[PDB]
């Protein structure tokens, strides 16, 4: 319990361009259940070695927003352990990210409205981290 950004996590966020990391740190406390950082910024080995597969001409590993450092990925911590199956808590945890961004002013928003347009493309019923990824809006 009371998880905190390790040496790798603290760095990932410490390498972010914007101040989105702020909401993350505060959220860890504000939110009911702690959370562990998974990814924050892309090093010179990630997007660089991303072309290790084969296609070097199509070198452009921008599948996410981490490239622009305007987004990060985290995991909802519960019972002193990672809760990837307990999406229930994910609601109380993520809710802190959106609530923390409004008070801190930091740009924070998830992909919950994008799917509202028609159907659930994020697959919130499946329990995926589709919308989990937080980015600046």
Task: Evaluate whether 129 touches 83 at the Cβ level (below 8 Å).
Answer: no
| 134-135/71-78 β-pairing | antiparallel
Residue with Cβ nearer Zn ion (3 or 74): 74
Helix ranges restricted to H, the chain: 7-14, 20-30, 46-49, 87-104, 113-116
Please report whether residue 133 would count as binding Zn ion according to CB under 5 A: yes
133 known member of a binding site:
yes
Measured in whole angstroms, the distance separating CA 40 from the mean position of its chain's CA atoms is: 7
Residue with Cβ nearer Zn ion (79 or 128): 128
The secondary structure element, H or E, covering residue 36 is strand 35-39
Angle between helices 20-30 and 7-14 (to 10 degrees): 140
Among 10, 70, 73, 83, binds Zn ion (CB under 5 A): 73
122 known member of a binding site:
no
Residue with Cβ nearer Zn ion (36 or 64): 64
Considering the complex, what minimum distance in angstroms separates the CB of residue 17 from Zn ion? 16
Q: How many residues bind Zn ion (CB under 5 A)?
A: 3
Considering the complex, what minimum distance in angstroms separates the CB of residue 43 from Zn ion? 15
Measured in whole angstroms, the distance separating CA 26 from the mean position of its chain's CA atoms is: 14
Considering the complex, what minimum distance in angstroms separates the CB of residue 64 from Zn ion? 5
Site string for Zn ion, 29-68 (x = CB under 5 A): -----------------------------------x----
């Amino acid at each position: 319990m009371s998880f905190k950004f390790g040496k790798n996590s603290e760095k990932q966020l410490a390498t972010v361009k914007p101040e989105l990391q702020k909401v993350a740190r505060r959220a860890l406390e504000l939110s009911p259940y702690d959370f562990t950082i998974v990814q924050g910024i892309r090093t010179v080995a990630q997007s660089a070695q991303n072309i290790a597969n084969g296609t070097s001409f199509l070198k452009d590993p921008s599948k996410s927003k981490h490239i622009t450092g305007d987004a990060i990925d985290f995991a909802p911590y519960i019972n002193g352990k990672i809760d990837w199956n307990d999406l229930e808590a994910f609601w109380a945890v993520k809710k802190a990210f959106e609530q923390a961004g409004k008070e801190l002013g930091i740009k924070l928003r998830f992909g919950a409205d994008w799917n509202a347009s028609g159907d659930y493309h994020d697959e919130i019923k499946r329990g995926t981290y589709d919308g989990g990824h937080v980015e600046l809006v």
